[PDB]
Design an enzyme around this catalytic site. Structure first.
Site, short mmCIF file in Angstrom:
data_model
loop_
_atom_site.label_atom_id
_atom_site.label_comp_id
_atom_site.label_asym_id
_atom_site.label_seq_id
_atom_site.Cartn_x
_atom_site.Cartn_y
_atom_site.Cartn_z
N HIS A 41 0.81 -1.22 0.00
CA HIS A 41 0.00 0.00 0.00
C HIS A 41 0.84 1.28 0.00
O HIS A 41 0.28 2.38 0.00
CB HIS A 41 -0.98 0.01 1.18
CG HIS A 41 -0.34 0.19 2.53
ND1 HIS A 41 -0.23 -0.84 3.45
CD2 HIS A 41 0.18 1.29 3.14
CE1 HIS A 41 0.34 -0.39 4.55
NE2 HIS A 41 0.60 0.90 4.39
N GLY A 143 3.45 5.47 10.26
CA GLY A 143 4.74 5.28 9.65
C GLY A 143 5.47 4.04 10.09
O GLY A 143 6.64 3.85 9.70
N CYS A 145 4.53 1.00 9.28
CA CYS A 145 4.30 -0.09 8.35
C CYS A 145 5.60 -0.55 7.72
O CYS A 145 6.48 0.26 7.42
CB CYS A 145 3.32 0.34 7.26
SG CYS A 145 1.67 0.34 7.94
C1 UED Z 1 1.39 2.09 7.95
O1 UED Z 1 2.44 2.77 8.62
C2 UED Z 1 0.07 2.24 8.74
C3 UED Z 1 0.16 1.72 10.20
C4 UED Z 1 -1.04 2.18 11.19
C5 UED Z 1 -1.19 3.72 11.23
C6 UED Z 1 -1.28 4.09 12.67
N1 UED Z 1 -0.80 2.96 13.45
C7 UED Z 1 -0.63 1.79 12.61
O2 UED Z 1 -0.22 0.70 13.04
N2 UED Z 1 -1.04 1.60 8.03
C8 UED Z 1 -2.16 2.24 7.68
O3 UED Z 1 -2.37 3.42 7.94
C9 UED Z 1 -3.26 1.42 6.96
C10 UED Z 1 -3.23 1.46 5.44
C11 UED Z 1 -4.35 0.62 4.81
C12 UED Z 1 -4.27 0.61 3.27
C13 UED Z 1 -4.46 -0.82 5.39
N3 UED Z 1 -4.58 1.89 7.43
C14 UED Z 1 -4.91 1.76 8.76
O4 UED Z 1 -4.25 1.13 9.58
O5 UED Z 1 -6.06 2.44 8.97
C15 UED Z 1 -6.64 2.52 10.28
C16 UED Z 1 -6.08 3.75 11.01
C17 UED Z 1 -5.24 4.66 10.34
C18 UED Z 1 -4.73 5.77 11.02
C19 UED Z 1 -5.05 5.98 12.36
C20 UED Z 1 -5.88 5.08 13.04
C21 UED Z 1 -6.39 3.96 12.37
#
Ligand code: UED
Ligand code: UED
Lengths: 301, 305
Positions: A41, A143, A145
């Site tokens: 992603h 960040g 991921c």
């Molecule tokens: C990649 O770094 C990130 C990790 C999440 C962001 C905050 N803490 C984590 O562990 N992944 C994403 O943002 C992910 C992307 C999608 C295409 C799967 N989306 C996600 O986790 O959404 C839920 C969310 C995002 C931001 C804050 C709270 C929940």
């Protein structure tokens, strides 16, 4: 002596962490030989996160849209492909710090260490476990991921987890290093939630054995149980059912301590019934379920 | 999201660990520049450890009595010296993996990461606090001596602990890297007891702040207290006193959550007198005290090294 939650030394993995950027999105990548692995992603935009068509998004990319930085050094990407939810970026330099390694998919109850990273730099190391509902209880920020989970038995690193997302209860979901998710999750921002989680029973039993090995016997009793009666009781406390395979895996600990597995199962039923009455076990006032049988033997012996 | 007991990445230290053997005794050494540091009791034997004369034992030793192995390479010892309870071994070649570092002595209540090692080989990493009775609650087996504790700051490793012994209660005792013991312990093969331990109040408050930051809010209440009021009840429960510097240190967390330190002290006061009444905080049924305020800020904001 003593008993602690212990992670593997992280240096072998630190030498593989790089930063990967595509457009406005930065996360971490795992540089092994001449391939950099990261969550696919990273190629998404902010308008395309509910229903990304990854094959369509990838085709619109060239090698030079991917900026890969190892320390103060830009690596040149010479190829790119997708395997499940993992992007593979071929680079023109094999990582000189690549350790002996393999990729493994773990089962629920298995433990591993996590090297939490941001912008390709390590933040900290901790221990955790694949829950029965296929999530992990990590510590992860924006960040993170592309951070990975791993074991190091012998001199070989077993990579078993890459981080992709956070669910609404604050627990985390991700893939093996072949990009297949653990559990039913998908890498888009459509509504998803963790199923009800349960306690990893065989791990709790391992940890009681660890308590005996370190000199505690206050919770034992003169009772035994059948496997079937134990599971009927245990499931009323949201404990995972114990299988004959789990009984076998507890054999060595059973032999070391002289306490039959079904006798220790009887102690656990009583502990669930009574609580701890103000005592602690190995520094905890709750029953710990993130030590495997194999972890206990490694740390006690 | 989430909160875990977290160690520093151990890679910079792993590159410094070597095996040190003197006669029948083998333990770990720390190889920095062209000196290996390890516990001085490596020169003892059976009869000696009961009551050793380390000076007398050392003068009888030659360089070649010290076998230093760095992975598959024997290192040639060209000198040997003692500083307090630490033996220093000068070797003919500097460690090319030497990181930026310094030796520091920590204060009780401060935390650090331990790299447990066996035969010079790193085997596990975990986070520890120096307890108010100058012990640490580690996890160590035979051969663990010479394992070290450290912090990282920017890119500077601050070495603060080297492991020497275990006490009858299963807690552990060691020295800073200048060989001065933490706590009232001596390096001889005798049972020694630690003083009664206390809880590290400022770290408990830091952890309650981490709980709040992660949405765990049931212990909050409308009340506040005063330092003097709180400390009178802290003394009663074997809790360290809360000083004015502790309060200031908690400032960032206090302003980030909207809960003044003395508001949070009223919550902690209640938890002491009433308990948690079946509830948990960050997955714990006990008041955790091995996170400093800096640990909570670092983890909750993603600081990297
Ligand atoms: C990649 O770094 C990130 C990790 C999440 C962001 C905050 N803490 C984590 O562990 N992944 C994403 O943002 C992910 C992307 C999608 C295409 C799967 N989306 C996600 O986790 O959404 C839920 C969310 C995002 C931001 C804050 C709270 C929940
Ligand atoms: C050094 O490697 C060792 C560490 C102990 C071994 C068991 N767990 C540890 O943390 N230090 C000692 O063995 C120490 C040496 C003196 C010369 C200071 N002596 C000690 O307190 O030993 C207690 C003991 C009794 C029975 C078995 C093992 C250790």
């Amino acid at each position: 002596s003593g008993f602690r939650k212990m992670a593997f030394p992280s240096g072998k993995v630190e030498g593989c962490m790089v930063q990967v950027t595509c457009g406005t999105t930065t996360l971490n990548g795992l540089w092994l030989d001449d391939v950099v692995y990261c969550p696919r992603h990273v190629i998404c935009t902010s308008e395309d996160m509910l229903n990304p068509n990854y094959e369509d998004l990838l085709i619109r990319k060239s090698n030079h849209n991917f900026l890969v930085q190892a320390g103060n050094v830009q690596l040149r990407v010479i190829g790119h492909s997708m395997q499940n939810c993992v992007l593979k970026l071929k680079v023109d330099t094999a990582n000189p710090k690549t350790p002996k390694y393999k990729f493994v998919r773990i089962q629920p109850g298995q433990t591993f260490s996590v090297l939490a990273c941001y912008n390709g730099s390590p933040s900290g190391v901790y221990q955790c476990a694949m829950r029965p509902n296929f999530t992990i209880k990590g510590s992860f920020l924006n960040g993170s991921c592309g951070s990975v989970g791993f074991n190091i038995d012998y001199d070989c690193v077993s990579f078993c987890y890459m981080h992709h997302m956070v669910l609404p209860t604050g627990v985390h979901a991700g893939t093996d290093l072949e990009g297949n998710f653990y559990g039913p999750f998908v890498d888009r921002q459509t509504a998803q939630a963790a199923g009800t989680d349960t306690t990893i029973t065989v791990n709790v039993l391992a940890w009681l054995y660890a308590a005996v090995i370190n000199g505690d016997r206050w919770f034992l009793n003169r009772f035994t149980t059948t496997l079937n009666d134990f599971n009927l009781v245990a499931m009323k406390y949201n404990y995972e059912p114990l299988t004959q395979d789990h009984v076998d895996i507890l054999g060595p600990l059973s032999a070391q301590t002289g306490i039959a597995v079904l006798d220790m199962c009887a102690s656990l039923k009583e502990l669930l019934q009574n609580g701890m009455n103000g005592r602690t076990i190995l520094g905890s006032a709750l029953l710990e379920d993130e030590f495997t049988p194999f972890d206990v033997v490694r740390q006690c012996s």
